[PDB]
């Protein structure tokens, strides 16, 4: 609207509140889920 | 569809009675009418198939009658018959295949796989030898309302349920009073589960009632009534309702006092039974109240005394159960049972050429999901299908 | 959302288990552990605390959640307990003079009480179950009991003379009183240092975990001498030191917490 | 409980469950010191308990609790009875103190500590107030600003705070629900409490004796309401106040109704 | 049926014959252990009653899984019939009966027995595959 | 005979049960009482071990299979406790001052350990699982530990002033730590007077037989607060003198080794 007084990094300032809600953290989940699944094969698909 | 039944056991009763030095006087009636189908046939072309991995076949009847100069049978009679056969075999089987997998929920009676809906023509009505079967008489009968009636062993009426109701339930889940259940095929297997030996209560004495309401009415149904269910009589780990966490069921098995079981229709109740336990009668009915009792037992020894004590632990919860098994059965409409293929023929076509889920029937034909919602379009395809099933298995089994 | 009714609930079987909700109870819950001075003492430390506390985070307890209030003697805490956390832990020391003071401190904290108060000098008040106990607490607690008869006569004891009566408590600070079910009584109680209430037994508190630190398994939380149970939330150790103690505690929280579950009421 | 309840218009109503709630419940008055002064009399109690016993509720179901002074029965409240009534009287200089006892009782809180040294606290909702009980509580807040500084007030001179309670036994405050307050009280003699207002309490019943309906239980000056358990009565003694009790005990209990919540003993729940 | 199946077979063709609760399963009551001891204390197996028409499969871990991975132990149960069947009807249910109640059971070489004390929950990840 | 694999094993329901193995292991194998030298000075006989034998040899056992093994205190027996024989009894005295260490001695003997060595000049261990503990034998141990934090530093005790290390034992000759697993610690001990092993507990070993001679029974082997469990083979009996208490053992020895079982390892 007015860039309001010469602000700070603006993407930093959102980014380092962005990177620790459901988003982010889900993001990771599904990462790390898919990365598990991949690696073993004589767990059996224990997700059911 | 008539016109198919006949079709299938003239060539049932062909591939039957024609056989070699065979008497003539025992099929010139059945000669008749293989010749009066092949005049009627001959000049037609069909065609069948092309839903699904069904070939596209066209079947065109070109062939010759059978001669009544003999006095015996013969084998140049005989191969003639087995190769006029073999093609009107054939073509059933397909048109069969082709029937059993089309639905609709405008008019499902009305016949799909148009080659039925020509053999439902006039000029195909000289073929009709006899509608002798229990299906194609009840289809007959519908048509001409009247009362029906397919008869049952053992029939899979109830969908499949496993599931606990708690009146009074606790976050620890250590002193519960409430009632499991197993309604499964024929079979209803039912438990009351009091924590507390009915100590609290009034009386001393705990209720319990099941009520199970039919998808369709029965009628003549013999049912095996017996006390202590099984699956509900042993050490069991069991979830919350919403799944999170989970609690134990340690039972002690006594008796059903001032046991009822009520066979209703309509609300109004017509069969009514009081602690008879064994072979029993149900003449109609489309609901079922089983209401029993735990009874703390007045007088009891030290060794079951030291099980129900008077505060809150209670490792051993008295148990109060059921088993009711419907052996056999009537129905003014059709289910499938432990006795005939039926289903099983239809399942497995659309399961082999790989059937899309139609508007009607659910993704495999699962009864359960089949069954619990069964209306009226779902009861007319599935006598369809039945039907036509029964008619191919008396060809193909 | 209806408050005080209860109905049917309903579920399944071919319902799956969901996750673990511990990891989540932790951080959304707190913790209260009530050592013996004879630990802190034994100890001789004044950052321990805030050590068990850096521990606990490593289970996954918040700094914020866990806290650590101290008492004196199990009489002291017998007197007026406050047990206000949403997880109670209680180590308790044995002691074979105080066995059925640590008993009746059990049944008091493990079990939740609907208590009525009394006043003596106007009613005569009887048990109607075997749930109706008499708890008392205060300073020194000097109780005595007249049961009477069908015309409001005393039996063995005048209700005149209270010397007659029958003492069953001599200078206690906590009292569990269980008598006659069905009788008049009344009662002789120093009201001026100790307070007496009229309470019925309910079900269980799944909030609070005693842990007997010594000797042998001994508390008889029901009233009645046939059953002499013993729960889940009723454990035991053998102790030489209390370090050892607080690390087992810490090491086995997680089947502290599983072996309760937060309050019903 | 999440689940649903349903009913029907067509049932019946149902038998008295009065002359059974008598027999199965308890009862309890708060009678002033001043009462029982004016009476001069020792046996009392079990007349108006004999008195009872005509209108239905058994001998040992009625009980009297004597508290010496609005203020001494404010501080820390126990109530513990199935049915209570409290009389109440009434004083211009006393207004707003047994105007906080009213919203304290009539009301069921749910209280968390509130430390004040190591850490500092606000409100959110206009259900979230600060409730100080003892001997003597003087209570002074300053507000702070978005950089933790004070507004109009210095953070160490704590003469600058702003002094909201003195003097005072029991203290209900409410604070502009949003920023940060930093909180001078006298811990030693009043301990504080973050306490949220939840549904009312419908096991009380107060009974103003003399002046007229002044009670303001909400903080909020637009709905200043008068409940159903807040009653007046006009006195010229004690026994004429007593014996209309007795009298028109049914209405009291009929207007009053057992907890929904939880059994508890004290005026307030505890969460930590 | 029979002489007409009979007549097909010698006049070649896919024959049929529609059984009801037919008796395929010889009768096999047995047990196999994958982590067995001398004292039987910790065990993990799976037990199985093939009879008639009937089969009843149960398996059982005395450490209900707290040491396997994933907190979750694994059974399978292969019956290998001696005749091809179609257009099967079959019942399926969970919590099997006859594996559900206290035993003492011999060991393999009937020499020592052990005690058995279960205490059932429900089969996840279930799969019933029928192959050709 | 695949030694060092662990195959499927099958069997049947329909097999018949065997003979009586009893009459056979008597003699195939050898049993090893281990009796505290009150005993034998109590009794002040020189032939009451031939005595025992011939009275054995009655129920079955040869002469040569038995064995008694004498130990002064169970604090000495303690003091690396070597049970070589195909079947063990201890016949063990009470002592509520020695409950924590006739305690940890059932623990060490009763289960089987996998013991791997420990230095602590140089490293500083962690606990992995809950069975993974420090058992510290010698003649007197006087171990402290110092837990740490993610960055290597201390909480509340510093890496150089021992003093401020925290104590879990005292000039004890037998001791077995559990402390939070998930946390490195840093350690003080005795190392001239005393070992310290980490082991972890396996399986139990059904080769010995505790038989407490005294007070109730105490012993909580499982280090968790949650199990208190008692085990087939933890005996108790109730004692005035020694000479019943060795007629009942020998009378009743079928029970006793039904109880035990030859080992797996
Ligand atoms: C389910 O539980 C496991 C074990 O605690 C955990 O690793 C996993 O993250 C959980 N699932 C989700 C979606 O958090
Ligand atoms: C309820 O009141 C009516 C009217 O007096 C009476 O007839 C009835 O019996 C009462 N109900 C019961 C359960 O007694
Ligand atoms: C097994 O025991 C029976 C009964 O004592 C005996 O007759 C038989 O000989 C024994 N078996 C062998 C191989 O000795
Ligand atoms: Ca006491
Ligand atoms: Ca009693
Ligand atoms: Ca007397
Ligand atoms: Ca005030
Ligand atoms: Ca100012
Ligand atoms: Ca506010
Ligand atoms: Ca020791
Ligand atoms: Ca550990
Ligand atoms: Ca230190």
Redesign the interface.
Known sequence: KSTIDAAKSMATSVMKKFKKSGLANSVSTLTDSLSDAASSISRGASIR | MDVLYSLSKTLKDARDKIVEGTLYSNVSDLIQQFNQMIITMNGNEFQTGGIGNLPIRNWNFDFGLLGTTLLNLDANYVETARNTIDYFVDFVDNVCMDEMVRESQRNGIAPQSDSLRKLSGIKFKRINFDNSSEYIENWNLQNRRQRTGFTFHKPNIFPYSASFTLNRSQPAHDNLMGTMWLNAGSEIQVAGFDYSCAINAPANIQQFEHIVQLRRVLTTATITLLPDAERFSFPRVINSADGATTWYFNPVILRPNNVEVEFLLNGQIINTYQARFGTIIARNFDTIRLSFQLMRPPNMTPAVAALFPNAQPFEHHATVGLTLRIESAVCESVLADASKTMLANVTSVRQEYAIPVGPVFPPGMNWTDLITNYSPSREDNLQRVFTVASIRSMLVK | ??????????????????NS?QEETFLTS?L?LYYPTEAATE?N?N??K??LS??FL??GWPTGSV?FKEYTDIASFSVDPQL???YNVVLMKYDATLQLDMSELADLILN?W????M?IT????QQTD?ANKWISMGSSCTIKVCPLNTQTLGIGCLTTDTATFEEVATAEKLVITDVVDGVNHKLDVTTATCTI?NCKK???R?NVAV?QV????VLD??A?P??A?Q??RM???????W??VF??????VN??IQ?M?????
């Open positions: 959302q209806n408050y005080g009714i209860n109905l049917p609930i309903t579920g399944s079987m071919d319902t799956a288990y969901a909700t707190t209260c100890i430390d950052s321990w805030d050590t850096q521990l490593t289970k806290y206000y956390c949403d939740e609907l208590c009525n108060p006043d106007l009613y005569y008040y075997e209430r309910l079900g269980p799944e842990i010594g000797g042998s398994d939380i029901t009645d046939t059953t149970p729960t889940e454990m035991r150790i053998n102790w030489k030191k370090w050892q690390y087992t505690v810490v090491d086995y089947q502290i072996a579950s937060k309050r019903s009421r």
